[PDB]
């Protein structure tokens, strides 16, 4: 679909069999979700933003259905201010910026 | 133009006379530029992201040309790790997310 930006570009996603609301973020290299449980092994990681860095859990090759489109990639879980869908998954669903 | 998300969506922008590279960020409500000595009155503000909040200076009605497309609005200046174009301006240039 085509999504304008007058409001935050939030969409529903399916992950680990659960539904969640996430933000399509072209300013994020990776995808980070609020604290939650995900199957498989994870590795401690760190990522930074405007306020500095935070510690996250890195899960690899995780399937995520984003607004109807399928992706399978790295998903970081930690104290993010909001569920963020980054470029690593945005590219997989063929998402682009247009103007 | 159409910007893919394989790499960070950086574009050239013109502001306060200067030319710089900035990230088209759909996950940012506001526009934040790395410290720059802009003239004019400003108001103190606090903006947050991953890692926490930072103090910035808010300037209103500032002209910003994005990749040739003219816009004008609120611009925040502070210790951000990158020049960021938020939705307040992206909507003005008719930028959309498409997949």
């Amino acid at each position: 679909p085509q999504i304008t930006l007058w409001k935050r570009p939030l969409v529903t996603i399916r992950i680990g069999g659960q539904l969640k609301e996430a933000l399509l973020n072209t300013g994020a290299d990776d995808t980070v979700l609020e604290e939650m449980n995900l199957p498989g092994k994870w590795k401690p990681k760190m990522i930074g933003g405007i306020g500095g860095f935070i510690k996250v859990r890195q899960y690899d090759q995780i399937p995520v259905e984003i607004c109807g489109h399928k992706a399978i990639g790295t998903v970081l879980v930690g104290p993010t201010p909001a569920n963020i869908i980054g470029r690593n998954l945005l590219t997989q669903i063929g998402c682009t910026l247009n103007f | 133009p159409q910007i893919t998300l394989w790499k960070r969506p950086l574009v050239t922008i013109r502001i306060g006379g200067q030319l710089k590279e900035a990230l088209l960020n759909t996950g940012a409500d506001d526009t934040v530029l790395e410290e720059m000595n802009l003239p004019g009155k400003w108001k103190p503000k606090m903006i947050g992201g991953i890692g926490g909040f930072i103090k910035v200076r808010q300037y209103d009605q500032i002209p910003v040309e994005i990749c040739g497309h003219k816009a004008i609005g609120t611009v925040l200046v502070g210790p951000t790790p990158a020049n960021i174009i938020g939705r307040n301006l992206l909507t003005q240039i008719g930028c959309t997310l498409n997949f």
Partner: peptide, 10 residues
């Protein structure tokens, strides 16, 4: 308000 910029994993 919220400016969710996110760098590379570290």
């Amino acid at each position: 308000r919220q400016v969710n910029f996110l760098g590379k994993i570290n």
